[PDB]
Amino acid sequence: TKLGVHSEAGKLRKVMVCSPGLAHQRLTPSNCDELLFDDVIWVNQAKRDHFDFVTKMRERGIDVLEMHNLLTETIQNPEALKWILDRKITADSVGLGLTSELRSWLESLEPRKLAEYLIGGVAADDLPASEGANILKMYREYLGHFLLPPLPNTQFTRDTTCWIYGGVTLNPMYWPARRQETLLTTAIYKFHPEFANAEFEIWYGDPDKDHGSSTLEGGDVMPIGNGVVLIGMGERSSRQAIGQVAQSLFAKGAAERVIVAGLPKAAMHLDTVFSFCDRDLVTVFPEVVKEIVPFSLRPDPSSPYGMNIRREEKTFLEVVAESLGLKKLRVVETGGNREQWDDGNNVVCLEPGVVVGYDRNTYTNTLLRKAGVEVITISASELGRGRGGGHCMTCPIVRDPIDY
Amino acid sequence: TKLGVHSEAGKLRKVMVCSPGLAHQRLTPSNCDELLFDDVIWVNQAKRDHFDFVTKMRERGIDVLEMHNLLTETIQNPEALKWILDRKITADSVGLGLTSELRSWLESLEPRKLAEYLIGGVAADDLPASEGANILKMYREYLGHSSFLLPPLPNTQFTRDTTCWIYGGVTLNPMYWPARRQETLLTTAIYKFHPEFANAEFEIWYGDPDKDHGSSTLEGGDVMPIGNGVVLIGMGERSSRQAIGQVAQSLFAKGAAERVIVAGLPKAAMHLDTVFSFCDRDLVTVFPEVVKEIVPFSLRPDPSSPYGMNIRREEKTFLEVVAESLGLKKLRVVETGGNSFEREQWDDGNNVVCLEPGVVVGYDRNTYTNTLLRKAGVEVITISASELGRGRGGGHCMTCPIVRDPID
Amino acid sequence: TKLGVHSEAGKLRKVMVCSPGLAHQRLTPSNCDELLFDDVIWVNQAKRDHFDFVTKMRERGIDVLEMHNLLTETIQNPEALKWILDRKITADSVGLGLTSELRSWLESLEPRKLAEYLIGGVAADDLPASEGANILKMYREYLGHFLLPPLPNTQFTRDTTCWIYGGVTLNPMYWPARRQETLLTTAIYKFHPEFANAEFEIWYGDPDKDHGSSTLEGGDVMPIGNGVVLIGMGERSSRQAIGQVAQSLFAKGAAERVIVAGLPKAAMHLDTVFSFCDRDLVTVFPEVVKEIVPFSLRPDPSSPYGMNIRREEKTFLEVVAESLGLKKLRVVETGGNREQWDDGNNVVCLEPGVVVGYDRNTYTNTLLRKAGVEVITISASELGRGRGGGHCMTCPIVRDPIDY
Amino acid sequence: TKLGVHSEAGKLRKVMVCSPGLAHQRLTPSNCDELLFDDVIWVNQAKRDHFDFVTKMRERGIDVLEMHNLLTETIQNPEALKWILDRKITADSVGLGLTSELRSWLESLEPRKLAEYLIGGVAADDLPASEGANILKMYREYLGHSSFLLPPLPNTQFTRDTTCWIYGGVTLNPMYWPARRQETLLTTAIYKFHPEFANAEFEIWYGDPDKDHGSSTLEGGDVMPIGNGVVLIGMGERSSRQAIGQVAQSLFAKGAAERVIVAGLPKAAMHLDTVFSFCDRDLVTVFPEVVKEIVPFSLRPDPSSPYGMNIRREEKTFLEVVAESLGLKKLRVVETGGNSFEREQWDDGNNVVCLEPGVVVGYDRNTYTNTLLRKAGVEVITISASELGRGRGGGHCMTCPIVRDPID
Structure with missing residues (x-):
């Protein structure tokens, strides 16, 4: 029904x-x-x-x-991912120097793993070696200061x-x-x-x-x-x-x-x-x-x-x-x-x-x-x-x- | 300069x-x-x-x-008041049943007074008596809700x-x-x-x-x-x-x-x-x-x-x-x-x-x-x-x- | 009356x-x-x-x-000072290695100054150079840790x-x-x-x-x-x-x-x-x-x-x-x-x-x-x-x- | 050893x-x-x-x-209970009008129960009904005072x-x-x-x-x-x-x-x-x-x-x-x-x-x-x-x- x-x-x-x-x-x-x-x-x-x-x-x-299953399946439709990522990853939320790497990396992931990150957040450490990731890692170490919460x-x-x-x-x-x-x-x-x-x-x-x-x-x-x-x-x-x-x-x-x-x-x-x-x-x-x-x-x-x-x-x-x-x-x-x-x-x-x-x-x-x-x-x-x-x-x- | x-x-x-x-x-x-x-x-x-x-x-x-002087001057420009009220008074900020009466009262105020209210907020009590205003008072009285239409x-x-x-x-x-x-x-x-x-x-x-x-x-x-x-x-x-x-x-x-x-x-x-x-x-x-x-x-x-x-x-x-x-x-x-510390x-x-x-x-x-x-x-x-x-x-x-x- | x-x-x-x-x-x-x-x-x-x-x-x-005046005058009677100091300065409040210096120094002070310290407290710094004072000064510096509060x-x-x-x-x-x-x-x-x-x-x-x-x-x-x-x-x-x-x-x-x-x-x-x-x-x-x-x-x-x-x-x-x-x-x-x-x-x-x-x-x-x-x-x-x-x-x- | x-x-x-x-x-x-x-x-x-x-x-x-076992054993010694109650039940800790009835009730308890109460506290409700006990209840009810005679x-x-x-x-x-x-x-x-x-x-x-x-x-x-x-x-x-x-x-x-x-x-x-x-x-x-x-x-x-x-x-x-x-x-x-921290x-x-x-x-x-x-x-x-x-x-x-x- x-x-x-x-x-x-x-x-x-x-x-x-x-x-x-x-x-x-x-x-x-x-x-x-x-x-x-x-x-x-x-x-x-x-x-x-x-x-x-x-x-x-x-x-x-x-x-x-x-929810993780539903998200995992939703995310398999290119249009739905795009719709979420367009709103979730912007200069204002992630920063100028990280939007592109972060999104490319997320987009390369397998459906279920990507869904776990969308709900579990992303840490600088999850990113593949990069300068950006590195600056973030610096703020954490030197200042006690997540890309995605x-x-x-x-x-x-x-x-x-x-x-x-x-x-x-x-x-x-x-x-x-x-x-x-x-x-x-x-x-x-x-x-x-x-x-x-x-x-x-x-x-x-x-x-x-x-x-x-x-x-x-x-x-x-x-x-x-x-x-x-x-x-x-x-x-x-x-x-x-x-x-x-x-x-x-x-x-x-x-x-x-x-x-x-x-x-x-x-x-x-x-x-x-x-x-x-x-x-x-x-x-x-x-x-x-x-x-x-x-x-x-x-x-x-x-x-x-x-x-x-x-x-x-x-x-x-x-x-x-x-x-x-x-x-x-x-x-x-x-x-x-x-x-x-x-x-x-x-x-x-x-x-x-x-x-x-x-x-x-x-x-x-x-x-x-x-x-x-x-x-x-x-x-x-x-x-x-x-x-x-x-x-x-x-x-x-x-x-x-x-x-x- | x-x-x-x-x-x-x-x-x-x-x-x-x-x-x-x-x-x-x-x-x-x-x-x-x-x-x-x-x-x-x-x-x-x-x-x-x-x-x-x-x-x-x-x-x-x-x-x-x-700032009070600047704002009183500004709002004398009709287009500037409107620009301000379009963004400050809405169903999301004030509630469906308060927008029009609140906007009308504000627009009926003398420039200086209007500017003091824009910075100083508006309480349910400041409005002319009415149904919408009385319910806010009731929320404040019976529930202890803040009474500020405009914080x-x-x-x-x-x-x-x-x-x-x-x-x-x-x-x-x-x-x-x-x-x-x-x-x-x-x-x-x-x-x-x-x-x-x-x-x-x-x-x-x-x-x-x-x-x-x-x-x-x-x-x-x-x-x-x-x-x-x-x-x-x-x-x-x-x-x-x-x-x-x-x-x-x-x-x-x-x-x-x-x-x-x-x-x-x-x-x-x-x-x-x-x-x-x-x-x-x-x-x-x-x-x-x-x-x-x-x-x-x-x-x-x-x-x-x-x-x-x-x-x-x-x-x-x-x-x-x-x-x-x-x-x-x-x-x-x-x-x-x-x-801590001569x-x-x-x-x-x-x-x-x-x-x-x-x-x-x-x-x-x-x-x-x-x-x-x-x-x-x-x-x-x-x-x-x-x-x-x-x-x-x-x-x-x-x-x-x-x-x-x-x-x- | x-x-x-x-x-x-x-x-x-x-x-x-x-x-x-x-x-x-x-x-x-x-x-x-x-x-x-x-x-x-x-x-x-x-x-x-x-x-x-x-x-x-x-x-x-x-x-x-x-109060400062009354205390200053009370304190001029040897018996009253003694009565306060006996209760105010003990091992338990000041510490073993400080009772004697602290009391001797307090007792040498002029009436009004002594009364101001009894109400205003005493800091390690007020004490005349000593080891004790020095250890206290250490705890303050090294640990962020008053003799008399x-x-x-x-x-x-x-x-x-x-x-x-x-x-x-x-x-x-x-x-x-x-x-x-x-x-x-x-x-x-x-x-x-x-x-x-x-x-x-x-x-x-x-x-x-x-x-x-x-x-x-x-x-x-x-x-x-x-x-x-x-x-x-x-x-x-x-x-x-x-x-x-x-x-x-x-x-x-x-x-x-x-x-x-x-x-x-x-x-x-x-x-x-x-x-x-x-x-x-x-x-x-x-x-x-x-x-x-x-x-x-x-x-x-x-x-x-x-x-x-x-x-x-x-x-x-x-x-x-x-x-x-x-x-x-x-x-x-x-x-x-x-x-x-x-x-x-x-x-x-x-x-x-x-x-x-x-x-x-x-x-x-x-x-x-x-x-x-x-x-x-x-x-x-x-x-x-x-x-x-x-x-x-x-x-x-x-x-x-x-x-x- | x-x-x-x-x-x-x-x-x-x-x-x-x-x-x-x-x-x-x-x-x-x-x-x-x-x-x-x-x-x-x-x-x-x-x-x-x-x-x-x-x-x-x-x-x-x-x-x-x-500890509960040790304490139950201890208090079976009359001199040890007394030593404990002399120090735990006083006008300063319990109030002038509660000391005797509270001490009498405690001393009338079975060792195991007495020890559970010594560690677990005593509420006004635990006492046999009485004037002193009723006023504590009243303090707790009308004023929201804690009801523990013994914390x-x-x-x-x-x-x-x-x-x-x-x-x-x-x-x-x-x-x-x-x-x-x-x-x-x-x-x-x-x-x-x-x-x-x-x-x-x-x-x-x-x-x-x-x-x-x-x-x-x-x-x-x-x-x-x-x-x-x-x-x-x-x-x-x-x-x-x-x-x-x-x-x-x-x-x-x-x-x-x-x-x-x-x-x-x-x-x-x-x-x-x-x-x-x-x-x-x-x-x-x-x-x-x-x-x-x-x-x-x-x-x-x-x-x-x-x-x-x-x-x-x-x-x-x-x-x-x-x-x-x-x-x-x-x-x-x-x-x-x-x-913070692999x-x-x-x-x-x-x-x-x-x-x-x-x-x-x-x-x-x-x-x-x-x-x-x-x-x-x-x-x-x-x-x-x-x-x-x-x-x-x-x-x-x-x-x-x-x-x-x-x-x-």
């Missing part, structure tokens, strides 16, 4: 993931912050753990797309693109360095076979424009069903983006309502404090969720900009309940800073009441089980060494609707 | 500064960091000190242009940051923080439509507000046309190799320079003018800790190269290199800053701005360095640092030389 | 202050944090500003005691000792390095003429004991009158200290009630968010004060520990109002992160409606004036370059009561 | 470790920092890995003492920190953070009343829980009795000259050492064992960046001195000095850590604990360093670092050698 995500809990048929790899190999305690990644991880173990995650979904018949956050495929019903967003990331990730995913959606001939809409976003203060991040976006879309507004998703995203969905009739979850204020996305596990069940970080201010945004013909907004009176949990035609949501609280502390938010639902979470979250997983949910677990030693879990590491593409 | 800056110590004939103002009135201990500014300052007092600074240069014959630009006070005149050409610098590009947009509008500039002859070496410069960044404090065909450019956290190379290549292309000395700063973000400053023909202040570690690189034009230049690491200290580049046996050097109190006397050889404007508080500067032969005019130097300020950061005579 | 502080707004007759000096001269951007001081200041200007502050109170007949916070005389009615507390400071300040002030209260023969009680504290988790800081303590004492409980004043302080005051009948202002949670003392200006007027940082939880602590004969505690129902501002027999307090709000922002809290009251504040706080000072208060101002360029104002820089010793 | 540690690589005969436990169950992202611990760990898994660590040493004949001591896991056996004598270290002195109090109680110790012969070189040590601080990770009469002691943010001098003077007074090499760490707090570790007679791991900058100082006893010792800065590298002090031409060296992934293999010459216990994750250690001749037994090494851990920090044979 047609590409599209119709809820948070419906049967998952196709999802995109990206395994840890070269990017993470380039991590050092000293370059972590600038690479916008929490810490250094045991790469090979992380790979085995991500593989076990991938294997567990596949064994239940889910089609799991891995590694993109360790690709592992979190939820961040950069969002499938909302019969369409996708190409999210204008908060940190400029992360726009490199949205660039490669866009190349995939543009040129790859799984996408090029498939019907779907591009609701918002474009790697070729600036967006300025308009920013959107995957963790904040959820098409919950019933023509509704939840979008968290906080440190990473701005009102400027959300409005344009809503106007676009409305203009095409793709949605009836967009519920803006206003987060109070440490950057956090909606999915790190709120997640679905079943038709009427959710985990929650009580501390934030009870302070969320819900705003309803609806299509309005008598308005210049074509929509109107209303702050909702009830709590966010009541607003979401009613929007799904539910009397109330069953809620499992987690996080908070009872053997020990744990934060079981951010699990990824495979189908109603079937979830994948982390092994460490024993208390919370026990509550989810007691609440009727089957919890499949994977190791978090390296994958969840910092932020995000299953939800963060998956980008749903085809997920069936649920109901009223 | 033709626009252009030909040294660091020559006679300053014309300069741009910008007085602290509405932008600073909006500072708060909690929005400080996000507005890239060190701390809340007493604005009315800052203004009085800024005016004393301006008055002390003007009194000496120097033409001193106030304030308190850093405008440091006119040195966004544009550098290098020998009769200027650079419209691509700042490190995207927010600060809003300053360059306004300074560029002035250089473009204002009488003092639109009709003058000069080159635009590098830069452009309509383009995204990616990883190519350049900040004023790092640029120094020391003369004798040479240009010093610091390379550290704020000025990247990617920018420096294109600036040089552009300068070489028109023969405006013979050499670019890349001052390689090791590693807290700091510009060259923050640890190194000229006071006279052969005299400089220095923060030893950083300077003794700067790695120098000579960048010269070279026809036998695909990209037109060559680069050579220098084996002698950065100080010996600057010396040799200016035809001197040795630079006289005054040490300052230290965070003397009554710690102080940092770097960043004075030179008015003429041996005449400098400095801060009243740096009593030690100021007297070591006097003993070394310099007349030091002082201004109050209580508010202006409440952080990384300095007379050098607060001035953008437009016309400065050469030396020798 | 007898030493003692009977309110926050009564006529101030005797106060102790301490001018900026050698301690501040030893400040560098790199040693500020470890010296527990906010920033480097223009010492000579700070001195002129502190002098202008001192002069303004004296001109209104207030007896202003300056400077005490730049002495300028804030309110921090270390508190006069509560007919007695004083010798506060067990939070940061161990600051206990050096309480040591010198205790020597003054013990041996100096102004204190040695004066009648007063030592309610709590002792520089010769440990106190562990018991900590108290001046900014949190206020004897407001009517037998009541307000004591803020937050990051710097602990329940362990407050209880012992209350039990002592009760045991001597020095107070009828102690109102614990419970501060929510960046360390803050009560006086930085709450201050008196007149019999019924106070400035306030609304953000904190409205969240303060008031607890009343009273003498109770039927209890093992001799007191009982009750959380109060009403706001803290209503609780304080009633405890003074006032219908309500008039309140001037300030701070908050209207030309510009300012935080006018922490002014020091000289008499009802007569206050000393900082020149920069124009908005707030204007409100205080409109509220009937005469505001004398001093420069804050260096004195209030960071925390505290007039209140923080004064330690009241004799202040008359006010009324019902 | 007599208690005492005579080298870093000799055969380990007896060691103390402490398993993660209740203390860690109380960790939270917001109380982490205040409890001086890097992050929240999965406690049950940490315990399983700790046990694998313990089991791997025991299986080799090593007597491994578990937890998650750092107990690093038995290396609080006490060092140096040649048949031990140091009861005065920690940098006052909170951590509560660990030393408990370890001292064990060394004092426990059978394995009360009756053994050994010296107490330095330290004492009943005294305030002012600015004199010493941390385990900095101490290393490398043998041949020599002792290495790192001097940086955690071990001060004031302590080091008295430790040396005490060692010299009884002739337990001929020399103390002060390893001067430049300048993030770090102990010597964190950047430098022995693996064999002549082999050490090293974090170059720090090691190449350590300034060595030799401290020898000297009768012609008022304070009994002399100090001399060494002109050769710290590595050449350690070499010469052990009768070697050169130490074989394996580099690790770097935060190899598949970054790792830091410092802090392995040696069981015998060339036999070491390390972490599974440090694959690069581990194989460079094997190529250099070392058998590397590995344990899981997911929870235990979730920060500054390491096998060396997790062991407090009691009996270790000399080498040569």
